[PDB]
Amino acid sequence: ATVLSYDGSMFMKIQLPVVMHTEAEDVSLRFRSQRAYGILMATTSRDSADTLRLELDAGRVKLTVNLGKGPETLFAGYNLNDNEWHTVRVVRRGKSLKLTVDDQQAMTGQMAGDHTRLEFHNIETGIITERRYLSSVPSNFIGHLQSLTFNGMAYIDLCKNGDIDYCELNARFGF
Ligand SMILES: [Ca+2]
């Protein structure tokens, strides 16, 4: 429903009150953009390089997961910067990953190493603001997001309605 718009200088961050270590994530997000490159969503930790990161890369969705052994990647979809709405879904259960764009093929991967837990303090959109161990800085997002759900939490609406205490943002709500 509720759309959040980003002009390249805008962000929305969920800055969680205590560190999280998750064994599994289910993330879904609708987006629309003209840009071939740009952050969609990333988890960040103040204390490590761990991440579950989605971005546009050459018009594809690129998923990067780093649980402690280093970044591994998976791509799905193409020509997505057509300024039409697209959906992306990620499901991680320990070492197992699935990435699907527009309810097309589920792209699968298996993580290397013994790590199953993702450390994060923040869920970031628009701009990655916690950058210290940030492996590389994605371009800031220029476009629109809708229906961000992260482990059952519809953060655009939760933030819009002040239903949680954790949001920081300067992106623009609309429809
Ligand atoms: Ca970890």
Curated annotation (Swiss-Prot):
Highest taxon of source: Eukaryota
Listed name of the protein: Neurexin-1
Subcellular location: Presynaptic cell membrane
Domain Laminin G-like: 3-167
Disulphides: C159-C167
Binding partners and assembly: Interacts (via laminin G-like domain 2 and/or laminin G-like domain 6) with NLGN1 forming a heterotetramer, where one NLGN1 dimer interacts with one NRXN1 dimer. Also interacts (via laminin G-like domain 2 and/or laminin G-like domain 6) with NLGN2, NLGN3 and NLGN4L; interactions with NLGN1, NLGN2, NLGN3 and NLGN4L are calcium-dependent. Interacts (via cytoplasmic C-terminal region) with CASK (via the PDZ, SH3 and guanylate kinase-like domains). Interacts (via cytoplasmic C-terminus) with CASKIN1 and APBA1. Interacts (via laminin G-like domain 2) with NXPH1 and NXPH3.
Protein family per UniProt: Belongs to the neurexin family.
Main function: Cell surface protein involved in cell-cell-interactions, exocytosis of secretory granules and regulation of signal transmission. Function is isoform-specific. Alpha-type isoforms have a long N-terminus with six laminin G-like domains and play an important role in synaptic signal transmission. Alpha-type isoforms play a role in the regulation of calcium channel activity and Ca(2+)-triggered neurotransmitter release at synapses and at neuromuscular junctions. They play an important role in Ca(2+)-triggered exocytosis of secretory granules in pituitary gland.
Native source species: Bos taurus (Bovine)
Residues binding Ca(2+) 2: D50, L67, R117
Coiled coil start-end: none
PTM comment text: O-glycosylated; contains heparan sulfate. Heparan sulfate attachment is required for synapse development by mediating interactions with neuroligins and LRRTM2.
Full-length numbering of the shown residues: 739 to 922 of 1530
